[model samples]
Target chain A: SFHLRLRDDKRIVFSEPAVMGIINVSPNSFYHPHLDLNSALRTAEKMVDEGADILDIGGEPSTQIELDRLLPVIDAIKKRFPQLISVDTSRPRVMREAVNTGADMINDQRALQLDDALTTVSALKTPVCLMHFPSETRKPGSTTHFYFLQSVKKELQESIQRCKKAGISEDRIIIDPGFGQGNYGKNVSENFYLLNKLPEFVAMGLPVLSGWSRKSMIGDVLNQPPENRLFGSIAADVLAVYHGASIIRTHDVKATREAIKIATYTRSVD
Target chain B: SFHLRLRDDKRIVFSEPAVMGIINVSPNSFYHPHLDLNSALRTAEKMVDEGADILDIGGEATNPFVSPSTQIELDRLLPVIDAIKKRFPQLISVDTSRPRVMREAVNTGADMINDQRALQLDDALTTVSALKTPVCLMHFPSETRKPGSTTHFYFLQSVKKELQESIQRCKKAGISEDRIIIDPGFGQGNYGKNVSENFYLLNKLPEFVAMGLPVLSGWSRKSMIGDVLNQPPENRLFGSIAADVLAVYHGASIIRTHDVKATREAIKIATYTRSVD
Candidate 1:
């Protein structure tokens, strides 16, 4: 029933959800093939040219190798393109170093619950995307839809309040419903029950980013399997945009770009 | 939400919607260069191999701007239809508007008659009806360039009228109503229709479905996709797939496209979202 405006410091892109291309500096990330420094730079450079508005960089576990991988790619992307660069990490020192090296945003899956992590991003004045996952609760016997929606929103609201109380501006914060993670795929009911509340999160004025691109939760879509579901990923992107994802964080920029262009056609203003 | 039984025999296709891959037996068909007889047979053979639920074989290019003599269409298609049907089990639809060609195609064991003229040709109705073959009625206001009504209300109703008239004609000729399918004829009558108008029709395809007939959507790389997306043919692959997915979402039962596999994925995704019974 509405369109979401996802903005960077320079422009707002929300005729449809803007695409954020995924760039992993670590081999542990779901994308296979170990990437060295130059290969990472080349990957991000091509992403910027391939209709990506943002490049999100990082890994599964924090290590010295992960830090070495993150810094150079962030610096190279910031130096080469005017696009936004997000540091995806849970380490405090890495967050500080990335901000110093021209990282535009902080994407924390832990909701900045790491010790002094709240102030680390808040002090940087960078826009921090707080996801509601580590705080989500589907208590052992709790299978009701209300418990799923309420518990998800309560954790997200608490995360926002933590950021706000720590002097982070409402403008400096974003929200992700945190699909494909947190008890997602624990069961099909749990997955649907959780994502069903995404619109309620969007009903509040803040921007919501959906990272369900080719994720396992896409398989949770109608209980379909995971393999050969990139088309479903594109449809899920459109579904997320329709449900109010202001930004679509995806690995497939060209396909996502085309699908979102078509998705937004009903309300597309050019 | 419903299924259309596309054929009567063992090959009854149920409807989350099926894909109809275009296999032009002649080079004169849109995007053409004449395919020789053996070449055309291979082309159709490949279409069936590529998972085309219905192979739409035609000598005439489905474009209004192109023309092929009836003898050329009949000679070119009849042999290829028989050869491909003999080779594959997929249902075949002959894309011809002439009565004699339709008759010969049906005689050659073609499963459906997909007429661009909507069977408005001389004796086309009786000829198609006599075969008891399933037919797809396209809503092309052939040889006429009436008002270019771009509004959803105007175009949707206009298409409904064209379809209702085609169905009525099929009825008067004793063709069974159950054996009919409908196409909105993207950019067929409107050679100069604006992209916005074509897109409006694309968005309104579900309205076309309320007429209670199965719908066939065939707007791959057509001028309308080019104009709106500003994508050239070579660049329109993703754009074409995007529009095709949108069409499937809006209620297209049979996707008539050039690329069968790509469209099947789109249909697959749309199918994944639907509650299968």
Candidate 2:
């Protein structure tokens, strides 16, 4: 049952789901910790102390603006917390810079959709998280349309094919459903339904990463503000783990970690 | 797909699982509420405020070698009832023995009656049927065993059959199905092995539910869970809530608990999940 392995290891390991903490460095991002570098560092340290197995750092905010601010924080975090960092940016320049600074993985929202993105990741020789997006033309002003399962699967398979063609190792890839990037009502619903069906994607032999943390879907369902969405966020993360998500991405690391612990204990599974 | 309804309304309602809070009147109870009417009242108020749907108050101490005089039990309970009534007056249940106490409890405006004996006492069924209030009929082991002592059950089927026979007696005495609640009586029977048997009964509760009565479960701070987790009484709240949540998840509608606030939170979460479309 424990078939998945990281790029650097050959031994198969199976245990409770690992929490991947989110550290967004974009100033325009809706979440609070990403507004400044000092708070971002504090948030990173706090997430590590709160049981994050991987710290995912993104340079540009996935907001209304396409700002490329990934290098400085990546350098600072590499100097401080050298061991655990997953860089989140689709810009090949930022990816090359972060990987040069010893970032463990690259989480690209575009899933190497750009022509140079795959070559940049292939040169980095690190794990890459290939999240499903509706289109390659997403920017601050452009609107993306989702086609539920068909388009998501088509784009995800195409991204995997693109990465393979670029000589990126199969074990170095992870996939996400891209909950709200271009998702509206039915697209988001299909994303949630796709969670339990993760084995269908994992059958293609890649680790599955889920990033529902404090997304608008949570806000929509729970009717809670961003700060007060901790409980709902943890609940969704635990549900994702129950459905076989290998990695969970979230901003609220402490609460999500606690939910994983309790869910693991109550389910009597490791 | 939703069919459960409360007694007060004819409109179709969809609500979460109901949590039954525990209030132990006996001082020797493992988690006794600081031993005063004021403390008990405050605990009840806090639990109800924290979303407890039902309050279960037990007079006789279920501990080993700590039995109190019947008069002392009455004295310990009556004023506590008046105080609770003075505050949250709607859904208070009195857990007791002696039929006279049960009769007086209903007369005092208690909404439910929970007797460990399941109306096995002389005239208990007659007295209970006379009141329109609901009664929880709990199954107990034989009279020779101590409160938490271990007992032998050759088969759980037989124990459940015996319980159904007791329920039949209640029905024979004219207690309507809606007015009756069935409790598998987790700790009232034998201690360790019998406690396991009680859980088996809990697993097969749909059979009891088929008889058209709501089920109540009381496993808060019991010796079974304490023995399972190897924790002392004071530290069993988490395990107790875990067990209570499982019970609510399976089929039990009303949960009788000692840690009322914790149980309320757990049941709220469980009910939300169970109600998901």
Candidate 3:
């Protein structure tokens, strides 16, 4: 049970786990190639009709190019639909403009580690998601927490502390144990270990978002291409919610909604 | 973990949950209609190739009036069983409650007995004991009441108690405990009168798994999925996969399903999830 107040003063509550549909407007995206604004709007339309609570629009490019890419799509989507829109970027320049152009949230995969990233989010006053990427340098901890999961959890805790120190309120923050490859490819076991220990992240008292849709881990496990990972993606998303993930970011919305309904109901029963 | 010793001195271990593919040889089956011997054998071959650990063959339909006679059941099942056993030495589960069909099918190389009646028929316990084969005793709702009658209380408790009593009766009749499997039957007439009980039993399946026996779940495209997802049988594959995955997470050791390939892939993740700790 998690709720967030967007900058528009609209409240979105995760009574059932929320589905965040991914609209990858990027040439680097292996699953969905670059799309024009018309195509992006059409995809967003379909996602909303398919039960997406949020649409995450990302462009993996430079700050100017990402800004040039995302602002109109976000502006046009907010103009056309009432759905919450999240701008997925790591640069502060793109974040300020996207939110100013009607993006509701900032999903920084860099966890706001860039120069003035925290200051930029603090001034923007929008909801932010802090992630633990593979290349993230681990800060020294006061206590010795052994093993892979403990280390990841400790780093995420440090990130949360940095957000609080930068004037980001606790309620405005979300945490994602980032999946997929980073600077170097991550081992499949680490991602699954994070999934296995997801309840611990949920215990941090922030909404935990899971982005396992079409990840290479699914490819490694099921031996399927991105197009064929629907079932495996559904299974992992179902398990994510079953283990207490509050928001699931995915590429497939209709199937994720159906799968989440079953998992949510099953987990709700006493 | 559960293990079974087939009649050929071979072993079938459910270290991971076993997928028992369904092969309906009855015209009254709503999901899979009647298939002749060759079609049934071909389907069984595909199931085995798709990772089915057991093949369940049933000729009798759920409609009592439409259910075939014992001879007809044997006529439909025996050749399919023989053909599947001949093609691949796969473990075959004959889904029949009659003592005669049970004896004949096992004699014809069927490796297991799946009785919807839980061996409640006269001499069924003795017949299975004499056959010395693994039997999956499923919880079929009581038929003593008339069609319009109803039971007031929640029936999962009653179903669990009755299954326990059946287990005691089997042991008393000289059947080995290791050879007994329990199924909280899912579907029309087999699940409790209330639809919630089907999903509730699925949630509480760990209790049955704790009973020191393997638990089987058969929730493929039943009305439970229909009621929940508002989809017809043909379109309920994703819902069925989700339910089966939850069942495995809640400790179902055997999944009896029609779509073996999809169920196998989904259950692989559930099995790995349970294995994490």
Estimate candidate 2's alpha-carbon lDDT, on a 0 to 1 scale: 0.67
Q: What digit string (tens of lDDT, one per residue) describes model 2 on residues A1-270? A: 233333465443547677788887776555764767777788878887887877888756343232345556667777877346788887887777677766778888888877788888887767788987654443422222212343456568778888889988876777886666343333445556666455445434466788778777677777888877787778877877665567888888878878877765655552
Per residue, candidate 3 scores C-alpha lDDT tens digits across A135-160 of 43533232222245555766687889
CAPRI level of candidate 3: incorrect
CAPRI tier of model 2: incorrect
lDDT of each: 0.72, 0.67, 0.81
Residue B248 of model 3, lDDT score:
94
Q: Note the residue pairs that clash in candidate 1.
A: B29-B61
* lDDT (Cα, tens digit) per residue for candidate 1, span B182-206: 8878764333245666687888888
- What is each model's TM-score for chain A? 0.86, 0.82, 0.93
Candidate 1's docking class is incorrect
lDDT of 3 at B116: 80
Give the Å shift of residue A150 in candidate 2: 70
- In model 1, where do residues sit more than 4 Å from their true spots? A1-270, B1-11, B32-34, B61-68, B146-152, B188-192, B274-277
lDDT digits (tens) for residues A30-135 of candidate 1: 6433468888777787888888978898864445766788888887888889877888887878888887888878888888998989888778777888886733
lDDT of 2 by residue, B170-208 (tens): 889987666677777776323323456656666666666
TM-score of 2: 0.45
Ranking by lDDT: 3, 1, 2
